[PDB]
């Protein structure tokens, strides 16, 4: 309820860090690391962002691939509650990641002049 | 709470369509806060090290931090579920964290 005073998507940075970060303040709420492919082109597609959720690395970790060059990883859920259904939680997490990827493209789109 | 440790200690944030900025502190005490600036904020490096104040503001009273350099932190959301044993030393640690965040912002934007 206090989270609702915040914007839905917060884009983050840190000193000395090449990777970026994100906070999602609506359900499901989380902190995540933003990392990038080397051919990220940034052009805004007519089609909506449709990314993939997967397990990656060692040991296996949840990660999101936007397929437009942005990745989301090191998820930390900020909700204490556990979701009743695992399938619907993963779906909600993925949709949130898609919105974030779209919002990130607009951060770049706003800026390039 | 151990996953927090793979992150950098201080994360500076922004949102589209928003004038205010944001911060995440990922070491104890962990929190999300709103970062804002008054009209006398210069972003210039201070003569003394950052020495801010923690206080209660509004009615009802809510915690807020004033860097006294024009930078404010507010709308604190604690990210740790544990409750502190001594309330005095928690505030001291929280205020100290805020001082580091303000200083860090100054160095990032310098």
């Amino acid at each position: 309820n206090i989270f609702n005073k915040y914007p839905t998507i917060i884009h983050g940075e840190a000193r000395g860090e090449n990777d970026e970060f994100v906070v999602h303040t609506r359900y499901p709420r989380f902190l995540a690391r933003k990392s990038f492919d080397d051919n990220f082109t940034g052009e805004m597609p007519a089609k909506p962002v449709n990314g993939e959720l997967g397990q990656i690395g060692e040991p296996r970790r949840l990660a999101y691939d936007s397929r437009l060059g942005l990745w989301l990883s090191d998820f930390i859920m900020l909700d204490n509650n556990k979701p009743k259904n695992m399938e619907d939680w993963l779906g909600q997490l993925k949709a949130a990641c898609d919105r974030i990827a779209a919002d990130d493209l607009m951060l770049n789109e706003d800026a390039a002049d | 709470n151990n996953i927090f440790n793979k992150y950098p200690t201080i994360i500076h944030g922004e949102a589209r369509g928003e004038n205010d900025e944001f911060v995440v502190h990922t070491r104890y005490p962990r929190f999300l806060a709103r970062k804002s600036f008054d009209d006398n904020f210069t972003g210039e490096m201070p003569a003394k090290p950052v020495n801010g104040e923690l206080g209660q503001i509004g009615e009802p009273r809510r915690l807020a931090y004033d860097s006294r350099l024009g930078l404010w932190l507010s709308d604190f959301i604690m990210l740790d579920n544990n409750k502190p044993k001594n309330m005095e030393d928690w505030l001291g640690q929280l205020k100290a964290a805020c001082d580091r965040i303000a200083a860090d912002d100054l160095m990032l934007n310098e």
Partner: peptide, 30 residues
């Protein structure tokens, strides 16, 4: 009370954030 950031300070800070972000993303590219 807690201040709300003014438009003039926010526009200058937003531009500097954009310049840093463009520089940071170029290291990932190619």
């Amino acid at each position: 009370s807690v201040p709300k950031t003014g438009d003039s300070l926010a526009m200058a800070r937003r531009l500097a954030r954009s310049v840093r972000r463009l520089t940071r993303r170029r290291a990932h590219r190619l």
